[model samples]
Target: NDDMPVDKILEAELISDPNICKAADRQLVTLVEWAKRIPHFSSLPLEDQVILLRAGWNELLIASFSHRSIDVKDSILLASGLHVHRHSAHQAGVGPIFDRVLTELVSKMRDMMMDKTELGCLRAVVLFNPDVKNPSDSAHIESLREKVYASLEAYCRSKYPDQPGRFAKLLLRLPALRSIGLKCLEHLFFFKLIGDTPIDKFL
Candidate 1:
């Protein structure tokens, strides 16, 4: 036999221990059963099955070791919606540096929505605003709206063309502004409904 290092020989002692070997054997059996039972794993192509299971295994390990609380995880998921990677990266790069300065801005925005002042202002504007409806009703209106939406979409494309689906998912889940407050409704209407913009712009 090849000469195994002393530390390697010492570390190998765990493999000979009955309890440790029994646990390892049990784990192998459990995985074999899980692979047989789980539809996604069992149905995957022979080659792909290994890759998929490997990824799931890594994620399970990370999640098991993570320190984040349930509430924090839920809040982060809510704030991120479908674009978890973008939100995660954004928070990673800018979170600590700008938390204090941006906290007030976010707090103020939250206050406006909570209090309905901004929503009220938005409703007032929408009342007087002529371009409030879907402009596809008339050719002239359609053209105008098309131009508005095109520009909005273009801006969003520049920002996140690669992640349009994720952005759309995020916007679609936003609470209806009307139910929240008039000001919130107005704000939502301007950006989400009337503005010639796609969900990507907001994301």
Candidate 2:
């Protein structure tokens, strides 16, 4: 439903190329740089920042991948250029939960046609989640989360004036993102156990 171009380059670089590990390394570096640029992220205590990053990185990664998959239909495309059918992953021991989570994620991304700014703010909201254990300063972290949510709400209102519930819709996606994050970890673990490429290494 969206017009975003398929990012086949990423799949080619990370999957087909002999330098797959290098491509993953570069992606992590890029994610770090992107996270650091978020307003007030750099100002947090180092320990708090690390905790947030660890807790939220998987969610952000799946979000980014889903955004790039706006045109994907029926099958999930992995960084390895593997076109895994929704049911096939389940049969392969990846489980039905991962398939369902990814299916919903991709469907929502296509329907929302989220722009880069919206995605960035969503990542900020995920990163500043006050639920992360041992936050160096819970009150400050909550404040940051509220600010990011406010920004996202404002952006949604301003960008889609006709879509009155766009902000709420965006917020609703958070729980699904978290679920997908956990499932992605399991997916990575399965791959690791089989002696396939160590996907967790990139995370």
**Number of colliding residue pairs in each model:** 5, 0
Poorest 10 consecutive residues of model 1 by lDDT? 60-69
- Candidate 2 Cα outliers beyond 4 Å, as residue runs: 1-22, 76-91, 189-203
Best by lDDT: 2
Residue pairs with clashing backbones, model 1? 119-182, 119-183, 119-184, 120-183, 149-196
lDDT of 2 by residue, 19-109 (tens): 2445455556666666666766778899997888878877877776676556667665544455555555556576565466556778887
> How do the residues 1-203 of candidate 1 rate in per-residue lDDT, one tens digit apiece?
12212222222221222112243244335434433332223433454434433323322211111111122321212111221222433333433312321232223333322212222112212112224332222343233323333333343456556756532432332222222223322333112211211224544
- Candidates in order have lDDT scores of 0.28, 0.66
The deviation in Å at residue 97 for candidate 2 is: 3.7
Best by TM-score: 2
RMSD over all Cα atoms, model 2:
7.9
Model 2 global lDDT (CA atoms, 0 to 1): 0.66
